[PDB]
Amino acid sequence: NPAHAHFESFLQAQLCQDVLSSFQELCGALGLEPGGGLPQYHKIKDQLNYWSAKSLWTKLDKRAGQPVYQQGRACTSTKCLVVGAGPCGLRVAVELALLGARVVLVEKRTKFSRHNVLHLWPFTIHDLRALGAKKFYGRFCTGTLDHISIRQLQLLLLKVALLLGVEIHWGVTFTGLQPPPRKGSGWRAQLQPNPPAQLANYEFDVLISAAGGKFVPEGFKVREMRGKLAIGITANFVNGRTVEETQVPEISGVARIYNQSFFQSLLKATGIDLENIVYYKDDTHYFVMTAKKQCLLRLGVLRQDWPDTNRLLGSANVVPEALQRFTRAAADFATHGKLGKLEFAQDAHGQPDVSAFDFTSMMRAESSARVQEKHGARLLLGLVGDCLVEPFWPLGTGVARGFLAAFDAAWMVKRWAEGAESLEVLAERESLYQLLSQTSPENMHRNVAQYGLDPATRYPNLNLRAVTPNQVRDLYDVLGTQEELLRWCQEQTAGYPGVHVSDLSSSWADGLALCALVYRLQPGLLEPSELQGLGALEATAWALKVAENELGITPVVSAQAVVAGSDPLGLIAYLSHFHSAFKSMAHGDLCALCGEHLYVLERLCVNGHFFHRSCFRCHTCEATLWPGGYEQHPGDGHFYCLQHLPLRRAKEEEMKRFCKAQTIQRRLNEIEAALRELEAEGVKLELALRRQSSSPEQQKKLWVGQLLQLVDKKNSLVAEEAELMITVQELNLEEKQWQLD
């Protein structure tokens, strides 16, 4: 059989174009009518008598015999379409095909020319070799290697899927869904430029999308997650597979808190600042980095200081030659020269493999499902992979998250196909989406040899009813705090002579109100006899000091403006501190380092002195100085920090500590972005709130209302990152003990 001859040409291919040629040859021939559908598989093991293939069939049988498989009669009438052929899209197509639906895939690209590396969770490893992954790549999961290139996995899963009768039209660009003409008709899809007829009229009632990060489908809004600007570089080197490079240890990567010693060493060697570097020794060596803009400008890698991240990535703007030099230097300095000679990776384009990319902003989807019904037709929309959850690249969570999304989509579509209505399925999928953001090898089951599609075996104790049906009516489509703060103040005033509370401000400048407040904050702090023995300036200084000593709450107002009383908003915030402190348990005005008045959104006191928040940085390393790691020089008043003052479980815990450190750093970047945005908003609002301090009483109450809302939000957050920072010093601490070990 010439058809069977091209079958071994197929199953023995190593390049994508060869797979395409074999498929096209079978398309021209009429030997077996390739890819006609699922039943092909049930006849395909018949006319094959090579012993070496047994395991393949065996494994697929052991994968096609689960009761959850319904023996293939699950959703037979149903008909589907997958846009996107990454690992996630291939998993969606193949798994949805297994249960029996008609499956077609489309791709604008036609050649497997992505040569970078991907990281896989253990469940991804087991589920990936469940499809007989041994056959298509010899070195798969060989020992401790747990990292597979994009094209390798792409080819493996594509060959597996093509053994299971999936239909593909390459060179096809998705651009929308054609509305039904009339009653009883389903949804067609717009594809370009000119797909063949057999798909052009192929009509479907299910669509699961894996378009990736750059494309999201109709009917979904997008949210942006942003941080401080950071650019990254991806580099590759064609490996000679030599022993000298093979014996090289694989540094798991470097993060700012994670290897401060490594940054110090690389600065001493060559004075180069990075933010993150990770090194992968697969077939072609992978180097992923992110770093600091002015260190990157130091070598001139950029010519013009363009704020726009994508346009900063502009090739005309980017100095490529400097990029190659910097990549080479970063590599050979990171690996400590035992690589010896290095040669650039020859890409598909015809050049070295280097590129400049983004590590800051990520798209996100609030909703992972949409059932749209028209002309008596129920249509389902779901997202799998990066289109739903676009991750931080190097965390390596993309493939695992996409495969979890694939299982979610398969389960939910098979549930809806059985006549189940919209409410329960959308509720279930939103219930799993609420947990998807915290997927982790940690919160997964400890042993992995019994997984599948059933959501009960993947999320222990899943409250599937997390979202009531009535919440998704939108997802179905057919055609003055000052009053309450004051009231709390009176509640803290019961039985006090000489304390005549009338507003938020005038009743506190007396001074004894501070003592009464701290009294009922915690009983036994002071004897009642001495209550009438303090002076007003002394009383307010004492109250501030005791509040910092007992609760450690941040002062907002100094004693001079207290007795002056002309800036009540600070005292409002200061009382608001305790207003939020008991919400459950009890139910020189300028700056020199910033040359500006401490405008309240950035006004802060530095151990009994008055400077801005932004100006508080180390002159050497221009970082934020948190308690336990800095100490002020009294000679000049400048602010300086400390150094700146002139076996399987082993690798498992190493990876876990890397991931947790990086997560901490990313969280700090997120908080910094949030603080900058909120302080800009507060600046623009307080412009009026100070200038236009004569609004209507309702307007004045509203302004101060969100002023309090915002300041209380900062209080809660700064507490949260205070505890996170404390986690940082303690993690450095047992790093010191581990070095001591």
Ligand X SMILES: Cc1cc2nc3c(=O)[nH]c(=O)nc-3n(C[C@H](O)[C@H](O)[C@H](O)COP(=O)(O)OP(=O)(O)OC[C@H]3O[C@@H](n4cnc5c(N)ncnc54)[C@H](O)[C@@H]3O)c2cc1C
Q: Which of 25, 167, 275, 386 binds ligand X (CB under 6 A)?
A: 386
The answer to whether 201 is a known ligand-binding residue is no
Question: Of ligand X, Zn ion, none, which one does residue 382 interact with (CB within 5 to 8 Å by kind)?
Answer: none
Q: Which of 88, 369, 444, 664 binds ligand X (CB under 6 A)?
A: 88
Within 234-293, the residues that bind ligand X by CB under 6 A are 288
Nearest to 34 by CA among 72, 77, 4: 4
Q: Which two tokens stand for residue 94?
A: 């193949």
To the nearest whole angstrom, how small is the minimum distance from the Cβ of residue 88 to ligand X? 4
Q: Cβ distance 513 to 499 under 8 Å?
A: yes
Nearer to ligand X, 202 or 599 (CB): 202
Burial class (CB in 10 A: 0-12, 13-18, 19+), 717: middle
To the nearest whole angstrom, how small is the minimum distance from the Cβ of residue 133 to ligand X? 16
Q: Which stretch binds ligand X (CB under 6 A): 105-113, 458-466, 523-531, 617-625?
A: 105-113
Question: Of Zn ion, ligand X, none, which one does residue 233 interact with (CB within 5 to 8 Å by kind)?
Answer: none
Nearer to ligand X, 2 or 176 (CB): 176
Neighbours of 348 (CB within 10 A): 12
Question: Of Zn ion, ligand X, none, which one does residue 87 interact with (CB within 5 to 8 Å by kind)?
Answer: ligand X
Nearest to 443 by CA among 427, 462, 471: 462
Residues binding ligand X: what is the number (CB under 6 A)?
30
Q: Which stretch binds ligand X (CB under 6 A): 86-94, 140-148, 324-332, 510-518?
A: 86-94
To the nearest whole angstrom, how small is the minimum distance from the Cβ of residue 143 to ligand X? 21
Q: Which stretch binds ligand X (CB under 6 A): 206-214, 240-248, 415-423, 583-591?
A: 206-214
Q: Cβ distance 369 to 427 under 8 Å?
A: no
Does 87 bind ligand X (CB under 6 A)? Our answer is yes
In the shown chain, the binding pattern of residues 402 to 431 toward ligand X, with x for contact by CB under 6 A and - for none, equals x-----------------------------
For 451-511, where are the alpha helices, taking DSSP H only?
481-491
Can you give the binding site for Zn ion, defined by CB under 5 A?
Answer: 591, 593-594, 611-612, 615, 618, 620-621, 641, 644
Does 568 bind ligand X (CB under 6 A)? Our answer is no
Give the angle 424-430-433 at the CA atoms, nearest 5°: 145
Q: Which of 19, 75, 118, 296 binds ligand X (CB under 6 A)?
A: 118
Q: Cβ distance 604 to 596 under 8 Å?
A: no
Nearer to ligand X, 111 or 298 (CB): 111
To the nearest whole angstrom, how small is the minimum distance from the Cβ of residue 498 to Zn ion? 38
Q: Which of 121, 279, 393, 459 binds ligand X (CB under 6 A)?
A: 393
Give the span between the Cα atoms of 645 and 619, in whole angstroms.
10
Determine the residue with CB nearest Zn ion.
Answer: 644
Does 127 bind ligand X (CB under 6 A)? Our answer is no
The answer to whether 615 is a known ligand-binding residue is yes
The answer to whether 591 is a known ligand-binding residue is yes
Enumerate residues 6+ apart whose C-beta is below 8 A from 365: 216, 220, 221, 222, 223, 383, 387, 388, 389
Give the span between the Cα atoms of 213 and 208, in whole angstroms.
15
Q: Which two tokens stand for residue 740?
A: 């001591």
Enumerate residues 6+ apart whose C-beta is below 8 A from 139: 145, 283
Does 212 bind ligand X (CB under 6 A)? Our answer is yes
The answer to whether 641 is a known ligand-binding residue is yes
Neighbours of 516 (CB within 10 A): 19
Please state whether the peptide bond connecting residue 2 to the residue before it is cis, i.e. omega within 30 degrees of 0.
no
Enumerate residues 6+ apart whose C-beta is below 8 A from 459: 432, 435
Per-residue burial over 522-538, b = 16 or more CB atoms within 10 Å of its CB, e = otherwise: eeeeeeeeeeeebeeee
Residue that the structure tokens 């983004």 belong to: 358
The answer to whether 88 is a known ligand-binding residue is yes
The answer to whether 202 is a known ligand-binding residue is no
The number of residues in the chain equals 741
Angle, in degrees to the nearest 10, between helices 648-691 and 697-740: 150
Nearer to ligand X, 86 or 100 (CB): 86
Give the span between the Cα atoms of 464 and 456, in whole angstroms.
10
Does 639 bind ligand X (CB under 6 A)? Our answer is no
Nearer to Zn ion, 3 or 615 (CB): 615
Neighbours of 407 (CB within 10 A): 22
Q: Which stretch binds ligand X (CB under 6 A): 207-215, 505-513, 560-568, 622-630?
A: 207-215
The answer to whether 174 is a known ligand-binding residue is yes
In the shown chain, the binding pattern of residues 215 to 234 toward ligand X, with x for contact by CB under 6 A and - for none, equals x-------------------
Question: Of ligand X, Zn ion, none, which one does residue 644 interact with (CB within 5 to 8 Å by kind)?
Answer: Zn ion
The answer to whether 27 is a known ligand-binding residue is no
Does 513 bind ligand X (CB under 6 A)? Our answer is no
To the nearest whole angstrom, how small is the minimum distance from the Cβ of residue 400 to Zn ion? 38
Nearer to ligand X, 89 or 511 (CB): 89
The answer to whether 116 is a known ligand-binding residue is yes
Does 86 bind ligand X (CB under 6 A)? Our answer is yes
To the nearest whole angstrom, how small is the minimum distance from the Cβ of residue 233 to ligand X? 12
Enumerate residues 6+ apart whose C-beta is below 8 A from 41: 163, 164, 165
The answer to whether 286 is a known ligand-binding residue is yes
To the nearest whole angstrom, how small is the minimum distance from the Cβ of residue 602 to Zn ion? 8
Neighbours of 277 (CB within 10 A): 25
The answer to whether 386 is a known ligand-binding residue is yes
What letter would DSSP give residue 180?
Answer: P
Q: Cβ distance 118 to 87 under 8 Å?
A: yes
Neighbours of 614 (CB within 10 A): 15
In the shown chain, the binding pattern of residues 144 to 183 toward ligand X, with x for contact by CB under 6 A and - for none, equals -----------------------------xx---------
Does 326 bind ligand X (CB under 6 A)? Our answer is no
| Strand partners of residue 119 | 147
In the three-class reduction of DSSP (H, G, I as helix; E, B as strand; rest coil), residue 101 is classed as: coil
Nearer to ligand X, 119 or 579 (CB): 119
What letter would DSSP give residue 81?
Answer: -
The answer to whether 109 is a known ligand-binding residue is yes
Burial class (CB in 10 A: 0-12, 13-18, 19+), 73: exposed
CA 388 to chain centre: 11
The answer to whether 6 is a known ligand-binding residue is no
In the three-class reduction of DSSP (H, G, I as helix; E, B as strand; rest coil), residue 27 is classed as: helix
Q: After which residues is the chain broken (C to N over 2.5 A)?
A: 479, 587, 646
To the nearest whole angstrom, how small is the minimum distance from the Cβ of residue 592 to Zn ion? 7
To the nearest whole angstrom, how small is the minimum distance from the Cβ of residue 638 to Zn ion? 11
Question: Of Zn ion, ligand X, none, which one does residue 327 interact with (CB within 5 to 8 Å by kind)?
Answer: none
To the nearest whole angstrom, how small is the minimum distance from the Cβ of residue 737 to Zn ion? 24
Neighbours of 496 (CB within 10 A): 16
The answer to whether 183 is a known ligand-binding residue is no
Nearest to 676 by CA among 223, 228, 224, 225: 228
Backbone angles phi, psi at 130, to 5 degrees: -60, -25
Question: Of Zn ion, ligand X, none, which one does residue 119 interact with (CB within 5 to 8 Å by kind)?
Answer: ligand X
Question: Of ligand X, Zn ion, none, which one does residue 593 interact with (CB within 5 to 8 Å by kind)?
Answer: Zn ion
Give the span between the Cα atoms of 536 and 545, in whole angstroms.
14
Q: Cβ distance 664 to 723 under 8 Å?
A: no
To the nearest whole angstrom, how small is the minimum distance from the Cβ of residue 520 to Zn ion? 35
Question: Of Zn ion, ligand X, none, which one does residue 612 interact with (CB within 5 to 8 Å by kind)?
Answer: Zn ion
The answer to whether 519 is a known ligand-binding residue is no
Please enumerate, by residue number, every residue annotated as part of a binding site for Zn(2+).
591, 594, 612, 615, 618, 621, 641, 644
Please enumerate, by residue number, every residue annotated as part of a binding site for FAD.
88, 107-109, 114-116, 174, 286, 386
**Which spans of this chain sit near ligand X (rule: CB under 6 A)?**
83-89, 106-109, 116-119, 173-174, 210-213, 215, 288, 385-386, 393, 396, 398-399, 402
Please enumerate, by residue number, every residue annotated as part of a binding site.
88, 107-109, 114-116, 174, 286, 386, 591, 594, 612, 615, 618, 621, 641, 644
